[PDB]
Design a protein around this ligand. Sequence first.
Ligand SMILES: COC(=O)CCc1cnc2c(c1)c(N)c(C(=O)NCc1ccc(F)cc1F)c(=O)n2O
Ligand SMILES: COC(=O)CCc1cnc2c(c1)c(N)c(C(=O)NCc1ccc(F)cc1F)c(=O)n2O
Ligand SMILES: [Mg+2]
Ligand SMILES: [Mg+2]
Ligand SMILES: [Mg+2]
Ligand SMILES: [Mg+2]
Ligand SMILES: [Mg+2]
Ligand SMILES: [Mg+2]
Ligand SMILES: [Zn+2]
Ligand SMILES: [Zn+2]
Lengths: 182, 182, 367, 367
Amino acid sequence: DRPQKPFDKFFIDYIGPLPPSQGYLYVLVVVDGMTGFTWLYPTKAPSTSATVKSLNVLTSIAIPKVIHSDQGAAFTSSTFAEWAKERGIHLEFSTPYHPQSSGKVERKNSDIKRLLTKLLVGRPTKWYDLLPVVQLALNNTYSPVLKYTPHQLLFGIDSNTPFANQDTLDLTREEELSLLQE
Amino acid sequence: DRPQKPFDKFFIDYIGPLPPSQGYLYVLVVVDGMTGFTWLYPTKAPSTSATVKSLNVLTSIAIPKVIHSDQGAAFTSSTFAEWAKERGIHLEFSTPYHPQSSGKVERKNSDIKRLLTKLLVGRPTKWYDLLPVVQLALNNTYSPVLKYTPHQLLFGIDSNTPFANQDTLDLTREEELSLLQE
Amino acid sequence: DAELDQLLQGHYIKGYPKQYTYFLEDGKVKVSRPEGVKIIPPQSDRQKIVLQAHNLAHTGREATLLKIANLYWWPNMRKDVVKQLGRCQQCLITNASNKASGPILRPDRPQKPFDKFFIDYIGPLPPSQGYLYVLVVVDGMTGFTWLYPTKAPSTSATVKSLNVLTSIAIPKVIHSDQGAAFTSSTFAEWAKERGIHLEFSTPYHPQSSGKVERKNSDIKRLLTKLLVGRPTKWYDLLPVVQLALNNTYSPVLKYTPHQLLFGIDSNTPFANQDTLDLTREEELSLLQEIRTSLYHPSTPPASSRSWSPVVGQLVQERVARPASLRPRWHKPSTVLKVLNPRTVVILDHLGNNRTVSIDNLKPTSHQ
Amino acid sequence: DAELDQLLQGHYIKGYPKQYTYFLEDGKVKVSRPEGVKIIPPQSDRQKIVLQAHNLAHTGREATLLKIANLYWWPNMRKDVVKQLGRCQQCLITNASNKASGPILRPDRPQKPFDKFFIDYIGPLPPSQGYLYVLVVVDGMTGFTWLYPTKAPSTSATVKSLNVLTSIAIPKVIHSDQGAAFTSSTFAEWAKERGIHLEFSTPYHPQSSGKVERKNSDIKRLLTKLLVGRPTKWYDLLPVVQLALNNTYSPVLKYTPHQLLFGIDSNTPFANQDTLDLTREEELSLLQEIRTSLYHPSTPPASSRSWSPVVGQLVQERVARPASLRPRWHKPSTVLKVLNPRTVVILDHLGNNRTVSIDNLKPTSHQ
DNA sequence: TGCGAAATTCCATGACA
DNA sequence: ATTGTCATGGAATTTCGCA
DNA sequence: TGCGAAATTCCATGACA
DNA sequence: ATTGTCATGGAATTTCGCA
Ligand SMILES: COC(=O)CCc1cnc2c(c1)c(N)c(C(=O)NCc1ccc(F)cc1F)c(=O)n2O
Ligand SMILES: COC(=O)CCc1cnc2c(c1)c(N)c(C(=O)NCc1ccc(F)cc1F)c(=O)n2O
Ligand SMILES: [Mg+2]
Ligand SMILES: [Mg+2]
Ligand SMILES: [Mg+2]
Ligand SMILES: [Mg+2]
Ligand SMILES: [Mg+2]
Ligand SMILES: [Mg+2]
Ligand SMILES: [Zn+2]
Ligand SMILES: [Zn+2]
């Protein structure tokens, strides 16, 4: 079998609804299966329109051979199917109620949910501006299995923003209390 | 003595007052002494101002060493004297009531007065537009003494408007009668 | 499919080299070339493939081929690529030329004064005494120049000024560019009435009026120096500038335009007095000899990759004032006649005859 | 008069050749030279004579001398003529240069992606969806390009777009021209906050941003072809154009900007499949070798009459947006340091330090 | 028949919207 | 049916002044 | 070891306001 | 403190297919 490569498969999913931040409520998560590289797009609804509008930005940079997602309504619509067919993208769905992907992608999506929660507290409505720094952190995080960051696997170089200070990713006692009040 | 040359001496004089033509009443006549070449400038008064304004046009093409004229007030004024001194032009006046110049210039000024009279009749107020064709005629008229036209002596070439049909320069019987009525 | 059929069994077909193994796989004819395994599409599919690769970014010969060569191979690919490039209308009218024009002509200096005038307008300038433009009239043989201030580059202001000028002498020919003041019928009737032949530059090619255009430079340059530190009141300086330039030496000619016109300086500063002892006739004799011995330049060497027009060739005229995001070149045209190596008549994109300069043409690529 | 006194009696004076007869006539010292009889003005009058002849039309060396030589002669006339030309302020700031710049530099390609960005604005364009400009961001190593539509070339629109871009990676350096959007303090604070060093072209010299300026051409050229026959609705085409050019082959490099950035094509038409059997690590190993073996051009030959700047030399900066009938050159300046054969620091006409390109300088003539 | 310096010629450069 | 041009100042070349 | 043709490389040209 | 660039298509050169 052929070795796995970037752009072979994109894993997409929606995070939300979140507290309103500049009119946005959701985050469309796109993770490259081979490198673990992550793109984050803010949307206003888990709709096919918002999905197509956001992926149109990503696919003007690189087009995946396959997109994988759960059976969410935005992804199983005939509109999204026509959008994927026009670009030569094959759609691949996980079985209902049985979400699956890969160990690397599962853990990456775990990190994203946790990293967002830690910065939600204290400023739940300012996450729109933090999405850029969130992606840099996720993409320059060291991978124990591959022994390389997503940035290095995608570009073949070291990054100008190496996140050496590996964050705790756990909620401190104060943040635990303050998040509970909401 | 040095042979006579163009621009050695300009002879100037005023013709008028004439019937009003586009607001002008006089003609400032300038004749080069050596070639017989003639410039005609329409003015509104035999004044120093009109004289300076008209000669300023001519002296942006060629500047004479000497200007000769009668003792008319416009030429004997201290303003015109300062104008001539600024340009290095020497002023030369004929004795009061004893106008003099040269045979060639005397005859040229005769032709100009006669040629203007012949075209004044019938259209006494349209001479402003005819001044261009009047100069071409005067300057391409054959000289019996020098056996060359003013155009040829000034430029050293034949002219693109050779006036072969030498006009009568005399008033026909009809023009004699019609001019008398005015 | 019939051609590719005999290839799979082992028969020879011209264009397909014999020393390679052509096999079938996934319902596609393939071949093992040094660069890798490529698909050999049937003849009937090759035009559509070249089209799809070209249309990605409307790339030229090599950038289109490199895309096709990633997947396919067939005999003489670039031949089919060049075939599509010559049929792509968007590429033909948008791309730039890469062939320079032939070397410039140095037309003969007019033999006599008043043989040919070159006229043109300068402006608009800063308003001075209510005036905005300057009519520049240059005698082609002498360089002698007349300056007239106007309020607009109008036909009416041109006729007014030339009526005053031609009080001294009538020219044979007046040469102008195709500006509005000079191409009106009113200007043509004014010239026909006086035996003056009007001669027009090819459109949008100021080189053709280069004699007066070059004088325009000297005029502006001297006006600039005279107005340093002062407000730009240029109206009262035109006579000063006209007289100054008409008496300025051309270092290569060794004469001033005044001297070439009259053969003797007037009462200006530093008047040359060399002919003081000659008669006027001896002076004019020396003048006719000087006028015929003036330096004349020669056509320069052609550049490495220049083109020269041929009757029947496909060429394209440059678009005059192209809008934003619009092509810079017209649809292809046919060359009708070659008046000189730098001037041609073409069958226009509208359908008319048009006399144009080669600098506003490109040869249509890929024939 | 003391010098010219000994000349009349027959004594020798250095500079005055002995084999000529110098006599007196009309109260003026004269000499019979081959060209004719000329006046020898005393030393104390020669400066004023050169000045009067020059000021007629502010002529250069030979045209000024020919005027003087009509009447006068003295030892080393042109020496006194050049002396006045170097003191005429109006001539020094108005005349054109006749020495070309030294040959261009071909700076090293950035070694890695995201080492250096080149950014610039295109526009204004025909209004499309309310947008008028395009921010163009070009990675210097790969040529990979990002296109952002804006309503103005503003600092606020630049920060907004670069915040979205740098979501993927932060560059070391951003290179821009000195347009207003990039030179504001708000843009500097935005870059300092991110460890980005801002690097600015020399003023009024778009060659220095040549990497992105050249990409601007490809962008407009492709937009033009796509909009032939249609109304100029370019907003919805920017993503199409960005993707098309990022996957277009450079014939001299043999690679597309996408390939140089990622080392492997994505699911685009005609995707190159050469590395399908290598692992990603073997692919990235081949990518680092390709990135260091790319073609790099060399400095071209200097032209026949080029000048190169020297510390302490007098030079003059080109006037940015010169008004009508105003000089094109500033008062002379002194070269302080030579950063490279094409870039210098000068002591400005106002009094400041200024880093300028040699293409916007001329050496002051006559020292 | 030859040398150093001055005088002259050569000619690339750039701007005429 | 029309067509580049020429001032400018360093450099290259010729000429001059003298022996 | 050499030929005709195809494939590849060379590189002047021109436009990025 | 900063620096020209590169798609394009004929032409020039190299390589290929075959003997
Ligand atoms: C329909 O035809 C038109 O509208 C022509 C308008 C017109 C008239 N006179 C012009 C121009 C255009 C013009 N573009 C130019 C012009 O671009 N001059 C610059 C110029 C460029 C190169 C050159 F070798 C000489 C030049 F004067 C011009 O000088 N004149 O006199
Ligand atoms: C105070 O500084 C300013 O106002 C500079 C304004 C400005 C900004 N961007 C520019 C320009 C001027 C500008 N003149 C140009 C410009 O003239 N471009 C044409 C151009 C000419 C030669 C070249 F080699 C490349 C080019 F893009 C430009 O491309 N950009 O991006
Ligand atoms: Mg989901
Ligand atoms: Mg009188
Ligand atoms: Mg014009
Ligand atoms: Mg013009
Ligand atoms: Mg810019
Ligand atoms: Mg630009
Ligand atoms: Zn095309
Ligand atoms: Zn001056």
